[PDB]
Symmetry: D2
Subunit: 239 residues, 4 copies
């Protein structure tokens, strides 16, 4: 039956709002030791918050060290931090592309690398990247966001092929449209016709994404590596 | 946090041995009402067993009716029944191909269709096909088994696109090499070199597969449709 | 500069009309020796026809013998035979499911199996399955057609993993909506909004599908194995 | 019979040696007008060379201007520039990750973005990214290279979803192990067993990759958008 629960040291980057906050709150109610990074606004509830600029490898190192001094080495990393900056291809600047790449993809690398030091040594790690349906489905006007979120799949698979033998796995949770992430633009997209692409005919909730992360942080996911778990109501189905 | 547990009416086909038995036992310990089909040897533990020849649409109908009279309409169908009959392509007979197709693919259709009658009406259904790494990875000498297990993905996605709006989802759990499913031939394959293709460098356990099925049967999987959840230690990574 | 052309012995199953016709005509205009199977309608133009029902393994054997005596053993097999028979899941009968499986999936196996012995001896073979966007995208009301066309992918990959080392490869061309296959019902579906699913905003032509098959039959595809080549205007993009 | 050839304005980035050289030579022998970017080594044969560092958006702009003045605006862009810099995850520095991202992923964006305005106006464009089996298969020690090459897929699909309706498509050619790219270390890895990962049991040739690019630049690929064409001997098969 159900394996005994283990309280893991968890770090959720960008875990102070939206999807990240739902993940942090769910993992904490699961019984884990949950820390979050933010960019200044502060941590939620009673969760341990650390400020972190995920474009700065020095800040990532110091943020991880502050977490380790508080709750011990990170066993479950949820790399949720990341921005969206949409544009038509011909209107997308170098700066708009690189900023989304640096925060969403390189930022996730910086955290995964910094986490791997103790994970490999302790022979246990769950690296959980928050991707997007856009990575493999290609939402228009997202050359930068879709590249960053597809890049997480390649990185997770390279990490898993190297380190799964040492008990360190890397997987991607790929949300579709999620209520806490809905902007004016996304809402108008739904009204215009985007729901036709979603079999479930509704947006998801942040708590639905948190439920998949809870699974991947649990004792029931030890043989899952390099997987993309879509939480999108079927939107991303294809090849 | 964690949503309240709902005890669901569960049917696990071929749930009397190997992976199916681990699934049935896990879902029962989760708190669900679990029935299993078998081909005569009998049901395990105290689980409600029904005999069922999944090549016979009439037997599937009568098997589902016996389950419904016992525990109510099936809310979670785990289509685990299926045989393996390997051969080199040039040595594979029509009978060897069709028998694996009929039990693994058409058999899963017969159950999914028979389950959909009440699922659609009650606006809740979890159809969980047990696939295989071979469906998308192509283990050699498995023209029939890989076709049947890839076919489950197409079927699950067509079902989900039609019925996810009515709360009925279809997903695939795709195991890799699993300890209870190891034959002499598969064991010799591992010794010859098959472990090199598995990042985790070990076979999985039936209880690891059961852990993913437990997730997909749970209240944490409502926005997941048409997904392939690989339980393979990273073996199936690719495109 | 470019590779010298080699005239191959080609068999196109179901090449009397639509996509199969365009494939047969293109491969013949390429310089290949093109035989076509049919069920009474005959072969197009001056091409060598053989009457063959791909649900009948004895007819497949006889058809390959006639092709071998006429133009030498088949070097490039294009398995195009097979049709859809749509229905909502709850309305789909066993017969409607199995008829589609037997023609599209098992029929393609019968032909690939019969071709395989001589391809292996000559250390050259191109097995080209004609799939569908539905295999991985899951068009609603196609539990049978999506299962069959996704099954082709698993079969192609198992065949490739077994035989690519002998120069025998299997690949899938996966058309989206194609003009010659547009029925009144599909046209009304496209008119009602299904054109929004296609980034190209138009249906494809049978000649556009034939162009992909021409490539896979050519000297420029020797290192391609287990691939799905989508000819769908972007419709199928996803995971 | 077959489509009439159209001589396209082609730009191959990093076309001085290896795969890029073979692509440039093949597209020129096809009849195209082929320009090549380089960083000092020059263009092959009689082809028009432009010195361009694809990490520099100003150099990309200047390079496209030189190509436009010489042969007309780019109709077919082959984004081949970019190299690997492998390391175990724990040993990979920020610089080693970002250098690979900036050349392979951001560099391809800079070129696709700069090409896009004129392609849209003329309602014709072929953006062809050169990816890698590693993007979806995850070669170990390539967190950076797999992330960059998987990122190309997401970018190609977002571009296709946006612009395919204007006749501008983006696709990825994903080579496996190719002779011209085989270093001493890769050769020793293949010798040590990595050849078992390749069903074809051999490395590919640069000319085999060029054959796939030739197809995607041709009149036979108008309805292909967001596709990954693997040229890997079957190595990358999976999900």
């Amino acid at each position: 039956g159900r394996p005994a629960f283990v309280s893991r040291s968890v770090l959720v980057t960008g875990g102070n709002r939206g999807i990240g906050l739902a993940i942090a709150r769910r993992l904490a109610a699961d019984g884990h030791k949950v820390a979050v990074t933010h960019r200044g606004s502060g941590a939620p509830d009673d969760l341990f918050g650390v400020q972190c600029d995920v474009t700065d490898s020095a800040a990532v190192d110091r943020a991880f060290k502050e977490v380790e001094e508080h709750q011990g080495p990170v066993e479950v990393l949820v790399a949720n931090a990341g921005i969206s900056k949409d544009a038509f291809l011909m209107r997308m600047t170098e700066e708009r592309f690189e900023e989304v790449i640096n925060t969403n993809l390189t930022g996730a690398f910086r955290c995964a690398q910094r986490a791997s030091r103790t994970m490999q040594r302790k022979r246990f790690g769950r690296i959980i990247f928050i991707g997007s349906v856009s990575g493999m489905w290609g939402i228009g006007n997202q050359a930068n966001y879709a590249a960053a979120k597809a890049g997480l799949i390649g990185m997770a698979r390279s990490i898993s092929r190297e380190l799964a033998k040492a008990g360190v796995t890397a997987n991607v949770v790929a949300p579709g449209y999620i209520d806490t992430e809905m902007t004016r633009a996304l809402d108008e997209r739904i009204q215009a016709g985007a729901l036709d692409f979603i079999p479930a005919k509704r947006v998801g909730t942040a708590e639905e994404v948190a439920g998949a992360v809870s699974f991947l942080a649990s004792e029931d996911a030890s043989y899952i590596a390099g997987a993309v778990i879509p939480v999108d109501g079927g939107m991303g189905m294809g090849h």
